[PDB]
Amino acid sequence: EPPPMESPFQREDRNPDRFDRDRLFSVVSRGVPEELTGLLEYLRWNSKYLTDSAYTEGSTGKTCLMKAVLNLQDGVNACIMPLLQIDKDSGNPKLLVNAQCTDEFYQGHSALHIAIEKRSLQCVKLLVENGADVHLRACGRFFQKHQGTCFYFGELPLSLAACTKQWDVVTYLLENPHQPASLEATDSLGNTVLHALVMIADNSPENSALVIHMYDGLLQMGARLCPTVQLEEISNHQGLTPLKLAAKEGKIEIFRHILQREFSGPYQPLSRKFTEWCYGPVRVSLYDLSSVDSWEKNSVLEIIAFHCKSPNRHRMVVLEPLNKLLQEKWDRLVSRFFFNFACYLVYMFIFTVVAYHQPFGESMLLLGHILILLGGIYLLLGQLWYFWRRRLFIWISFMDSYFEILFLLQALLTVLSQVLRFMETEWYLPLLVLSLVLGWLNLLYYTRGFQHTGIYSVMIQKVILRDLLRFLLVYLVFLFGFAVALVSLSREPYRSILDASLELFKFTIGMGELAFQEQLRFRGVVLLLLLAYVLLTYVLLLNMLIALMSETVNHVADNSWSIWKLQKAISVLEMENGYWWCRRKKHREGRLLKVGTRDERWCFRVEEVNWAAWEKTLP
Amino acid sequence: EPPPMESPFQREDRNPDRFDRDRLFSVVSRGVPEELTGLLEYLRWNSKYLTDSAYTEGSTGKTCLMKAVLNLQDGVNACIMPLLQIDKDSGNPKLLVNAQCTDEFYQGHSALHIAIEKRSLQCVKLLVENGADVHLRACGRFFQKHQGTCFYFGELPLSLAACTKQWDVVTYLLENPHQPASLEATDSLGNTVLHALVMIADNSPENSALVIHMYDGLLQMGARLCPTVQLEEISNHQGLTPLKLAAKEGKIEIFRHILQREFSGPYQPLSRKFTEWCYGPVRVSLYDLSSVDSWEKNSVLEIIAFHCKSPNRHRMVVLEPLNKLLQEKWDRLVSRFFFNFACYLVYMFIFTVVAYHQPFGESMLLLGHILILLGGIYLLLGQLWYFWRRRLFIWISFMDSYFEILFLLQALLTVLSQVLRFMETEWYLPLLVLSLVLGWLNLLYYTRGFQHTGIYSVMIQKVILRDLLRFLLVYLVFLFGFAVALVSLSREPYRSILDASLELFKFTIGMGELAFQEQLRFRGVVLLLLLAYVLLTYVLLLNMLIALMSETVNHVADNSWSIWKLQKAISVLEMENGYWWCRRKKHREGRLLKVGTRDERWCFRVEEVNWAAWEKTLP
Numbered sequence A, B: 001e002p003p004p005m006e007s008p009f010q011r012e013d014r015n016p017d018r019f020d021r022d023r024l025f026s027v028v029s030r031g032v033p034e035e036l037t038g039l040l041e042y043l044r045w046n047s048k049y050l051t052d053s054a055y056t057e058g059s060t061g062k063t064c065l066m067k068a069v070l071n072l073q074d075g076v077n078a079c080i081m082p083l084l085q086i087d088k089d090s091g092n093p094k095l096l097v098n099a100q101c102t103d104e105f106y107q108g109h110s111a112l113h114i115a116i117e118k119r120s121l122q123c124v125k126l127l128v129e130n131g132a133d134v135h136l137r138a139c140g141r142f143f144q145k146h147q148g149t150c151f152y153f154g155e156l157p158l159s160l161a162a163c164t165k166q167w168d169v170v171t172y173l174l175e176n177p178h179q180p181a182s183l184e185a186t187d188s189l190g191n192t193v194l195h196a197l198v199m200i201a202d203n204s205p206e207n208s209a210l211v212i213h214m215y216d217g218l219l220q221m222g223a224r225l226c227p228t229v230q231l232e233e234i235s236n237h238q239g240l241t242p243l244k245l246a247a248k249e250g251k252i253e254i255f256r257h258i259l260q261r262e263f264s265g266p267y268q269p270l271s272r273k274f275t276e277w278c279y280g281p282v283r284v285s286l287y288d289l290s291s292v293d294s295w296e297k298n299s300v301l302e303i304i305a306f307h308c309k310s311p312n313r314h315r316m317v318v319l320e321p322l323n324k325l326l327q328e329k330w331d332r333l334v335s336r337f338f339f340n341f342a343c344y345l346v347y348m349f350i351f352t353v354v355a356y357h358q359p360f361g362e363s364m365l366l367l368g369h370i371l372i373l374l375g376g377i378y379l380l381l382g383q384l385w386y387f388w389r390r391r392l393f394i395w396i397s398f399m400d401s402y403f404e405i406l407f408l409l410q411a412l413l414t415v416l417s418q419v420l421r422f423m424e425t426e427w428y429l430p431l432l433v434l435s436l437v438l439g440w441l442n443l444l445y446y447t448r449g450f451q452h453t454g455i456y457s458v459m460i461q462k463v464i465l466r467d468l469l470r471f472l473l474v475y476l477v478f479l480f481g482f483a484v485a486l487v488s489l490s491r492e493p494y495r496s497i498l499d500a501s502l503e504l505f506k507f508t509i510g511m512g513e514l515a516f517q518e519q520l521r522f523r524g525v526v527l528l529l530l531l532a533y534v535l536l537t538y539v540l541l542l543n544m545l546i547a548l549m550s551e552t553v554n555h556v557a558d559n560s561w562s563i564w565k566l567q568k569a570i571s572v573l574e575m576e577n578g579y580w581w582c583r584r585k586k587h588r589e590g591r592l593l594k595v596g597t598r599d600e601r602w603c604f605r606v607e608e609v610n611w612a613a614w615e616k617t618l619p
């Protein structure tokens, strides 16, 4: 187990007048500099420095200075200032202010971070004035974002202060002449201070206000300290800007504010929603499409659809300008979507004809077999190309890509069945039939193109289809357990497990032949198993109905509309790439408009009609 | 019927100037000492005392002094003080202040208790200064905790004052020089004052604040009056400390406060949650495992799992440190749990093989029969050992031990079937089959080891399985009633009750042959019974569905997670004892740490990450 950061009870790890390690740590914690005065003599006598491993705990390397700042008294510790002085006179080649832990848990932890966390501006000023680096990276396992014991604030003192909304500390760390902290400074994972605020943000409104206020103030202060730097353009090692990161992490509240950010006054160039004109309840705004339009790779639209895995994906594609941007794309692509639907209907109309009318008529059948083979190959190549593109995030959103698997599965069976027909084996007919069955089920994918049908479909396939596998797994365990019991008991009907499993399943569809069976010597006991099976399978069905019905209470119809918009969003961003055989170019959305002075942006004109909001401002 | 305590309307039970009993009780109730002045002369004339049975009601022994305190006027009665004086001059060998009732209902009731209940500090001071014992036990049936007419406050004046939050009275009873009341003082059932507050506590928050405030103040005052006494270490006749009693009675609010009690300042040694270090939303506390760890017999963990019967059991195993303590144990024992699961799967894989493949192959069957016999004996001995250990609380938590019954039942049938095979009777095959059926159903017990499967299972078996027996009891009554009717009507199909019961049941599984039957002379009337049975059995099914569906509204998913944690808690505390053939030693949890001065405790380090709570304290 990793050692604790500070412990009044547990002692630190062991692994002129004497000033050994234990008595050194005792005086610094109590905050009495009077007893510390002889430390310089002992250090001079031994020709050693406070940064030496002898004056720290070997498990972490926690120095005496870091010990001192962990027991602040009313926001200050009188022992830390003499401690730095004695270190200065000791001739330390490694200054105590810049000392860091070495443990895998608290790696990079420094005395400056402790002072920032303890909300003591006095210690923060005192350490920085003495040369405490403001770019020390606390890159330990405790500070990394993961399940369980963690506190991610970035890795920098400036980012830690921002995450604790210490407005006084961030002001000093930026404006101090001794050692200013750059806003461009970057942690080990590529996250800046703005990125850190994004990925600590929750969807709760108390913490969303914290992040939005910190994000707004730091962005506005960045315009003063570094006017030539656009802080939102810095990307992590994953290549994500703070806007893109908010999309991937699925944090709507911070995502919405950045996407619709508007500043009035001198800070206008930092805005992303430039209002254009208003007439009554009609508002027109020029939303900025920088890093939002799908024309550029790794955009926000692609990240939400294919890279985000949070349950908040459907609620993000309805925010402006994404709602209107996707609608603008959908109206341009709805003609192609129906053409794709028409081609699949023709392909499966031919599939049905060949499957049924199978042994000029022979020539039509010969052509039908050939067209099916080409159609199956075409679908197989298209689906393989889709999975090749989405190879980095397979099985991450299987609830949405399950139709793309079915199209591939039907394509594989279509091609394989034709191959078996070439081999003239009798087993080609089944595979051709299962291809026909799956494809007619795959026709339900295109219902998303119609609001009239797509909205209704969304309410259904969300949970119910995934629930049935959970009942079947127990039911099949129950089915095989009773089947062997009946077979082992009827051998002195149910001639084999396969027949016994068949008979037991018939009881579920209301066709069981629950009788004495008139033949078996153990007719009563065999009946007991059938009666027990009937009671057990109805307990399981009632167990299923109650659990499934529980989802009805919490359902909201707005979610079904939102999910349908996400389904159209995924389809648009896939068919924008054209086809596998023809990767047509992508049209850039919006128009280039000058919005200020650094300032031209690819703005997208969104018009907003809202009677309720307009009447609220009215007297 | 027990007589009333006080009655303005009903007279008390009958069973110098004259001062008979009736005129004595009249003056004391009215509170006029002027008419009482001659009482000394009458007592002197008769050479009698007020404590004599003549001056009380024979049904209870309620004395005149207890009569006086039952009619206090504005918190005081002017007659009680002269009453004690006249008793003093009467030469009473049994002082009136210490007089108690003799009725089985109000046994031990004294005048001091009445003054405490009536919230009169003036009478409380007046009686105690005259020698009223502060350790009088009111051990009547009225003061014992039971259904109906009762008021349990312990049995002592100090405990009564604590239960009525009379802060002024408890202060006096503890600090009075005349007769201080010991906090160690114990009632008839072993309960001290701290125990009394625990078992009058409700889970409501108005009364929880009452108990917590009284528990905290009395514990803190105990450190001043008796610093050398640890009041929480006193146990009842059942052997339960106040912490253990709160667990058995299932009162979370008082249980949580004691389990996580933290005091800052001089009262630190009374704490049980010693905070260690804090960094942002990360809090680390040293919870005390005294009487909590399962290493010691009759611990809190065992009491909640096996001794508590309240519905609050699942909500207690999620409180810290119990939540982390059980998780620490579970991670150490999850390797053994799967090994136990693997052994049962192998045992039932062999059971299935022998059951099916039954008349080198013969040698394998011979070995399989032998291995099943040893496996059945092993399970039989293990389950008997489990019930021997839990013999004191069988059928108290049958909802949790019902799987342990099924394992025993399957073990008994496994052994008995092999015994019958030795006898070479034909009836061994059925019992071996029912053993196979039950064991495959017993495999559902091990689903609790996986969160992925255990959580889903908990939602189902809570109510639905127990509900079906309630429908079947009426249905079987309906089944036998109609079966005899059809048989008595078809004798001029349904040749016997057994066949008639079989045919009627088929209508429930959607296989009834509801026809005119073409043979019976009373074909129309027999059809009426079948039609009536169909309507009646669907009314019962609709009755069942509506009643069962009503449970969906009030269900909370947090309960299912909590119950699963309790299920793992029971399994851990059972497999900690090793096996019946090898009772391996128990590992003590936590580490011994010095926390103060009486002070070393077996503290358990629990680390708490809570962003929402941390942000609440932030500006």
Ligand SMILES: CCCCCCCCCC(=O)OC[C@H](COP(=O)([O-])OCCN)OC(=O)CCCCCCCCC
Residues within 6 Å of the ligand: A339, A340, A341, A343, A344, A346, A347, A374, A375, A376, A378, A379, A382, A403, A404, A407, A445, A579, A581
């Ligand atoms: C008009 C007559 C058509 C006769 C049948 C020919 C084979 C069609 C096979 C087929 O079903 O293609 C469907 C496809 C769209 O699939 P999707 O985007 O829904 O799939 C994704 C679902 N998630 O549609 C297309 O890609 C367009 C059709 C092919 C155009 C010409 C191809 C030339 C190749 C060199």
Ligand SMILES: CCCCCCCCCC(=O)OC[C@H](COP(=O)([O-])OCCN)OC(=O)CCCCCCCCC
Residues within 6 Å of the ligand: B339, B340, B341, B343, B344, B346, B347, B374, B375, B376, B378, B379, B382, B403, B404, B407, B445, B579, B581
């Ligand atoms: C590995 C090969 C095993 C072949 C079959 C041998 C008989 C096993 C019988 C069996 O099912 O035992 C299950 C048992 C655990 O039961 P539980 O704790 O779930 O039951 C409680 C459920 N509520 O498991 C155990 O206790 C461990 C298995 C026995 C170890 C060696 C025993 C030696 C005896 C001298």
Ligand SMILES: NCCOB(c1ccccc1)c1ccccc1
Residues within 6 Å of the ligand: A452, A453, A454, A456, A457
């Ligand atoms: N082909 C048009 C049918 O669309 B509807 C539809 C049909 C099947 C599944 C989902 C929707 C419909 C919607 C509302 C009322 C009636 C029908």
Ligand SMILES: NCCOB(c1ccccc1)c1ccccc1
Residues within 6 Å of the ligand: A469, A470, A471, A473, A474, B452, B453, B454, B456, B457
């Ligand atoms: N063997 C793993 C199956 O677990 B799951 C499961 C199966 C039966 C009963 C309870 C749980 C499951 C849970 C959620 C979705 C799908 C399946």
